[PDB]
């Protein structure tokens, strides 16, 4: 049934292209190991990177501080606003 051989001939191609990529990925797995410890070794020596960590940490922490104090602003602003809203004219005139 002839046509099956033709498709098999086609199927066998990939197969071959996958064999090539499978080898590649296995090698890349080794390269990832080849990137990561490597980074672990670098940590075993030093760097960390402590400075970068502090500065990036600080960036986000300051951003959280602006949010915390903005909360404090809405709180103080509205407590004072409403207290004034009442209180300044509470007696109106008296």
């Amino acid at each position: 049934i002839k046509e099956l051989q033709e498709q098999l001939r086609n199927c066998k191609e990939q197969v071959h292209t996958q064999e090539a990529q499978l080898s590649y990925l296995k090698m890349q797995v080794s390269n990832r190991d080849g990137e990561i410890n490597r980074l672990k070794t670098r940590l075993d020596v030093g760097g960390i990177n402590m400075v970068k960590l502090v500065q990036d940490y600080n960036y986000m922490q300051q951003n959280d501080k602006i949010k915390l104090l903005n909360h404090q602003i809405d709180y103080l602003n509205k407590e004072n606003t409403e207290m004034d809203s009442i209180l300044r004219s509470k007696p109106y005139i008296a």
Binding site: I36, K40, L43, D44, I48, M50
Partner: protein
Amino acid sequence: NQELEQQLCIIEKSLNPLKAENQKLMRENNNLQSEIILSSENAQQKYNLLTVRL
């Protein structure tokens, strides 16, 4: 200045190295546990073949 340095000295000689080692090893674990999940994916790879017949 010496005290400002001492606070840093304490931090750098006795605290940061512990944190550095602990985060190092925990990074090894984070890396490894991100991997390992990848080994559970290997369990999944087996599963994925069982599912062929399902």
